[PDB]
Amino acid sequence: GMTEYKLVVVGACGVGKSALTIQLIQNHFVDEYDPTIEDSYRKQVVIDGETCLLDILDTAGQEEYSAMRDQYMRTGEGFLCVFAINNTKSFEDIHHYREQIKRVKDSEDVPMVLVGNKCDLPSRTVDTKQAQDLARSYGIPFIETSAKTRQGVDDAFYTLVREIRKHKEK
Numbered sequence: 706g707m708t709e710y711k712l713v714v715v716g717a718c719g720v721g722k723s724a725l726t727i728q729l730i731q732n733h734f735v736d737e738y739d740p741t742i743e744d745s746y747r748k749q750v751v752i753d754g755e756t757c758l759l760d761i762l763d764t765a766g767q768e769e770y771s772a773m774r775d776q777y778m779r780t781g782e783g784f785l786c787v788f789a790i791n792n793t794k795s796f797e798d799i800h801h802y803r804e805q806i807k808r809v810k811d812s813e814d815v816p817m818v819l820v821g822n823k824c825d826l827p828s829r830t831v832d833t834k835q836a837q838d839l840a841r842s843y844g845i846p847f848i849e850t851s852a853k854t855r856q857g858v859d860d861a862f863y864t865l866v867r868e869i870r871k872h873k874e875k
Protein backbone atom coordinates (compact mmCIF):
# COMPACT_ATOMS: atom_id res chain seq x y z
CA GLY A 706 0.00 0.00 0.00
CA MET A 707 1.12 3.53 -0.51
CA THR A 708 2.34 5.37 2.58
CA GLU A 709 -0.46 6.69 4.80
CA TYR A 710 -0.03 9.74 7.07
CA LYS A 711 -2.42 9.90 9.99
CA LEU A 712 -3.07 13.51 10.65
CA VAL A 713 -5.09 15.05 13.47
CA VAL A 714 -6.52 18.56 13.45
CA VAL A 715 -6.96 20.02 16.93
CA GLY A 716 -7.98 23.39 18.26
CA ALA A 717 -10.82 25.19 20.05
CA CYS A 718 -14.40 24.98 18.77
CA GLY A 719 -15.06 27.32 15.82
CA VAL A 720 -11.43 27.92 14.73
CA GLY A 721 -12.14 26.26 11.36
CA LYS A 722 -10.79 22.73 11.80
CA SER A 723 -13.60 21.32 9.64
CA ALA A 724 -13.50 24.06 7.13
CA LEU A 725 -9.80 23.56 6.64
CA THR A 726 -10.10 19.82 6.24
CA ILE A 727 -13.04 20.01 3.85
CA GLN A 728 -11.28 22.65 1.78
CA LEU A 729 -8.25 20.40 1.48
CA ILE A 730 -10.19 17.25 0.57
CA GLN A 731 -13.23 18.63 -1.30
CA ASN A 732 -11.98 21.97 -2.55
CA HIS A 733 -14.90 24.00 -1.31
CA PHE A 734 -15.59 26.29 1.59
CA VAL A 735 -18.33 25.41 4.07
CA ASP A 736 -20.25 28.30 5.74
CA GLU A 737 -21.75 26.02 8.39
CA TYR A 738 -20.51 22.69 9.67
CA ASP A 739 -22.09 21.09 12.75
CA PRO A 740 -19.66 21.85 15.60
CA THR A 741 -20.37 18.52 17.28
CA ILE A 742 -19.33 16.25 14.39
CA GLU A 743 -15.99 14.48 14.49
CA ASP A 744 -15.18 12.43 11.41
CA SER A 745 -12.09 11.40 9.47
CA TYR A 746 -11.38 11.91 5.77
CA ARG A 747 -8.99 10.21 3.37
CA LYS A 748 -7.42 11.58 0.25
CA GLN A 749 -4.66 10.41 -2.03
CA VAL A 750 -2.28 13.29 -2.85
CA VAL A 751 1.20 13.89 -4.19
CA ILE A 752 3.60 15.59 -1.86
CA ASP A 753 7.09 16.27 -3.12
CA GLY A 754 6.69 13.51 -5.73
CA GLU A 755 5.43 10.97 -3.23
CA THR A 756 2.01 9.51 -3.93
CA CYS A 757 0.54 9.03 -0.47
CA LEU A 758 -2.67 8.78 1.51
CA LEU A 759 -3.71 11.43 4.04
CA ASP A 760 -5.94 10.08 6.81
CA ILE A 761 -7.26 13.14 8.58
CA LEU A 762 -9.12 13.31 11.86
CA ASP A 763 -11.16 16.47 12.23
CA THR A 764 -11.63 16.56 16.01
CA ALA A 765 -14.49 18.09 17.95
CA GLY A 766 -13.04 18.17 21.43
CA GLN A 767 -14.80 16.04 24.04
CA GLU A 768 -15.50 12.38 23.48
CA GLU A 769 -18.00 9.86 24.84
CA TYR A 770 -14.96 8.44 26.69
CA SER A 771 -11.66 10.10 27.31
CA ALA A 772 -9.94 6.88 26.26
CA MET A 773 -11.09 7.71 22.72
CA ARG A 774 -9.17 11.04 22.83
CA ASP A 775 -6.06 9.21 24.10
CA GLN A 776 -6.50 6.63 21.31
CA TYR A 777 -6.42 9.16 18.44
CA MET A 778 -3.56 11.06 19.92
CA ARG A 779 -1.48 7.89 20.19
CA THR A 780 -2.53 6.83 16.71
CA GLY A 781 -1.99 10.27 15.21
CA GLU A 782 1.42 10.82 13.60
CA GLY A 783 1.09 14.58 13.17
CA PHE A 784 -1.07 17.30 14.55
CA LEU A 785 -2.34 20.61 13.12
CA CYS A 786 -2.71 22.97 16.07
CA VAL A 787 -5.25 25.44 14.83
CA PHE A 788 -6.29 28.79 16.28
CA ALA A 789 -8.23 31.64 14.68
CA ILE A 790 -6.46 35.02 14.27
CA ASN A 791 -9.60 36.76 15.63
CA ASN A 792 -9.90 34.49 18.70
CA THR A 793 -7.28 35.17 21.39
CA LYS A 794 -8.63 32.38 23.59
CA SER A 795 -8.11 29.83 20.81
CA PHE A 796 -4.51 31.01 20.58
CA GLU A 797 -4.13 30.65 24.36
CA ASP A 798 -5.63 27.14 24.15
CA ILE A 799 -2.74 26.00 21.91
CA HIS A 800 -0.60 25.65 25.06
CA HIS A 801 -3.09 23.04 26.31
CA TYR A 802 -3.25 21.04 23.07
CA ARG A 803 0.60 21.03 22.78
CA GLU A 804 0.92 19.76 26.34
CA GLN A 805 -1.85 17.17 26.08
CA ILE A 806 -0.62 15.50 22.90
CA LYS A 807 2.97 15.18 24.18
CA ARG A 808 1.61 13.86 27.43
CA VAL A 809 -0.50 11.10 25.83
CA LYS A 810 2.13 10.05 23.32
CA ASP A 811 4.77 10.31 26.07
CA SER A 812 7.09 12.10 23.69
CA GLU A 813 8.97 15.34 23.47
CA ASP A 814 9.31 14.99 19.66
CA VAL A 815 5.80 15.06 18.15
CA PRO A 816 5.35 16.44 14.58
CA MET A 817 3.09 19.52 14.89
CA VAL A 818 2.34 22.61 12.82
CA LEU A 819 0.86 25.83 14.22
CA VAL A 820 -2.01 27.12 12.09
CA GLY A 821 -3.51 30.60 12.39
CA ASN A 822 -6.77 30.30 10.46
CA LYS A 823 -9.22 32.89 9.07
CA CYS A 824 -6.40 35.09 7.84
CA ASP A 825 -8.83 36.45 5.21
CA LEU A 826 -10.57 38.50 7.88
CA PRO A 827 -9.35 42.03 8.56
CA SER A 828 -10.51 41.58 12.17
CA ARG A 829 -7.52 40.24 14.08
CA THR A 830 -6.68 39.96 17.75
CA VAL A 831 -3.59 37.73 17.36
CA ASP A 832 -0.68 39.35 15.47
CA THR A 833 1.53 37.23 13.27
CA LYS A 834 4.54 38.09 15.44
CA GLN A 835 2.83 36.64 18.57
CA ALA A 836 2.29 33.29 16.82
CA GLN A 837 5.77 33.32 15.34
CA ASP A 838 7.23 33.73 18.85
CA LEU A 839 5.17 30.77 20.07
CA ALA A 840 6.13 28.52 17.14
CA ARG A 841 9.78 29.53 17.67
CA SER A 842 9.56 28.42 21.32
CA TYR A 843 8.06 25.08 20.16
CA GLY A 844 10.45 24.66 17.24
CA ILE A 845 7.60 24.02 14.82
CA PRO A 846 6.44 25.63 11.56
CA PHE A 847 3.79 28.36 11.72
CA ILE A 848 1.44 29.00 8.78
CA GLU A 849 -1.46 31.41 8.41
CA THR A 850 -4.37 29.96 6.51
CA SER A 851 -7.82 30.80 5.19
CA ALA A 852 -10.18 27.88 4.63
CA LYS A 853 -12.34 30.39 2.73
CA THR A 854 -9.86 31.55 0.13
CA ARG A 855 -7.78 28.34 0.42
CA GLN A 856 -4.69 30.42 1.16
CA GLY A 857 -2.08 28.30 2.90
CA VAL A 858 -4.28 25.22 3.20
CA ASP A 859 -2.14 22.78 1.20
CA ASP A 860 0.98 24.26 2.81
CA ALA A 861 -0.33 23.51 6.35
CA PHE A 862 -1.13 19.88 5.67
CA TYR A 863 1.86 19.22 3.44
CA THR A 864 4.26 20.88 5.90
CA LEU A 865 2.87 18.63 8.63
CA VAL A 866 3.59 15.56 6.44
CA ARG A 867 7.14 16.85 5.88
CA GLU A 868 7.45 17.17 9.65
CA ILE A 869 6.36 13.56 10.08
CA ARG A 870 8.95 12.49 7.45
CA LYS A 871 11.69 14.30 9.41
CA HIS A 872 10.60 12.54 12.53
CA LYS A 873 10.58 9.08 10.91
CA GLU A 874 14.07 9.31 9.39
CA LYS A 875 15.68 9.48 12.84
Ligand SMILES: CC(=O)NCCOP(=O)(O)OP(=O)(O)OC[C@H]1O[C@@H](n2cnc3c(=O)[nH]c(N)nc32)[C@H](O)[C@@H]1O
Nearest residue numbers: 718719720721722723724736738740765823851852853
Ligand atom coordinates in the same frame (compact mmCIF):
# COMPACT_ATOMS: atom_id res chain seq x y z
C1 LIG B 1 -16.06 21.68 19.34
C2 LIG B 1 -15.23 21.46 18.07
O1 LIG B 1 -14.06 21.72 18.09
N1 LIG B 1 -15.95 21.10 16.99
C3 LIG B 1 -15.61 21.43 15.61
C4 LIG B 1 -16.32 22.70 15.19
O2 LIG B 1 -15.46 23.84 15.05
P1 LIG B 1 -14.49 23.91 13.83
O3 LIG B 1 -14.53 22.66 13.07
O4 LIG B 1 -13.06 24.17 14.44
O5 LIG B 1 -14.93 25.22 13.01
P2 LIG B 1 -15.67 25.21 11.55
O6 LIG B 1 -14.76 24.54 10.46
O7 LIG B 1 -16.98 24.57 11.71
O8 LIG B 1 -15.78 26.76 11.29
C5 LIG B 1 -16.35 27.60 12.31
C6 LIG B 1 -16.91 28.84 11.62
O9 LIG B 1 -15.84 29.66 11.10
C7 LIG B 1 -15.98 29.74 9.69
N2 LIG B 1 -14.65 29.63 9.09
C8 LIG B 1 -13.84 28.57 9.14
N3 LIG B 1 -12.67 28.85 8.52
C9 LIG B 1 -12.73 30.12 8.12
C10 LIG B 1 -11.83 31.00 7.40
O10 LIG B 1 -10.68 30.61 7.04
N4 LIG B 1 -12.25 32.25 7.22
C11 LIG B 1 -13.48 32.67 7.59
N5 LIG B 1 -13.83 33.94 7.32
N6 LIG B 1 -14.36 31.94 8.28
C12 LIG B 1 -14.04 30.65 8.53
C13 LIG B 1 -16.87 28.61 9.26
O11 LIG B 1 -17.52 28.98 8.05
C14 LIG B 1 -17.78 28.42 10.45
O12 LIG B 1 -18.84 29.34 10.36
Ligand SMILES: [Mg+2]
Nearest residue numbers: 722723739740
Ligand atom coordinates in the same frame (compact mmCIF):
# COMPACT_ATOMS: atom_id res chain seq x y z
MG1 LIG C 1 -15.82 21.32 13.12
